[PDB]
């Protein structure tokens, strides 16, 4: 008989608490996390996509995960501009990456909480 240490797999790998005064600022913080965590260095070429400005965890989840898909295609979220009830996201071509590859934003602990002027939530990513 034996015991063999084995690796544990988690979808909850890294966590941050993001805060801001609006849904758009939480997305700006999700963007900041992706660039920083992945050590993304940007080229100058740009590309843009539209996302619905819906202040829900579901829209947040869909948006950030779409950014991760774009990152796998060589494009990183860079700027965010509100246009009516939608958000125009400008992506920049990724020159290089140096860091931890983020696989996805999970639904773990994703819940917007209001505290005065502050909107906040934990965001848990899978690596
Ligand atoms: Ca994992």
UniProtKB/Swiss-Prot annotation:
GO terms for molecular function: metal ion binding. InterPro entries: Archease, Archease_dom, Archease_dom_sf. GO terms for biological process: tRNA processing. It comes from the Bacteria. The keyword Transcription regulation does not apply. Keywords: Calcium, Metal-binding, tRNA processing. Ca(2+) binds at residues 10, 13, 126-127. Pfam families: Archease (PF01951). Belongs to the archease family. Activates the tRNA-splicing ligase complex by facilitating the enzymatic turnover of catalytic subunit RtcB. Acts by promoting the guanylylation of RtcB, a key intermediate step in tRNA ligation. Can also alter the NTP specificity of RtcB such that ATP, dGTP or ITP is used efficiently. May also act as a chaperone or modulator of proteins involved in DNA or RNA processing. This is Protein archease.
């Amino acid at each position: 008989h034996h015991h063999m240490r084995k690796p544990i797999e988690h979808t909850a790998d890294i966590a941050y608490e993001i805060s801001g005064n609006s849904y758009e600022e939480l997305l700006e913080e999700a963007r900041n996390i992706l660039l920083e965590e992945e050590g993304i260095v940007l080229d100058t070429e740009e590309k843009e996509k539209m996302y619905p400005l819906e202040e829900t965890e579901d829209a947040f989840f869909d948006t950030v995960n779409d950014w991760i898909l774009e990152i796998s295609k060589g494009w990183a979220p860079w700027r965010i501009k509100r246009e009516g009830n939608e958000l125009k996201v400008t992506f920049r071509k990724i020159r290089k990456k140096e860091g931890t590859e983020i696989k996805a934003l999970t639904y773990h602990l994703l819940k917007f909480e209001r505290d005065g002027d502050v909107l906040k939530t934990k965001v848990v990513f899978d690596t």
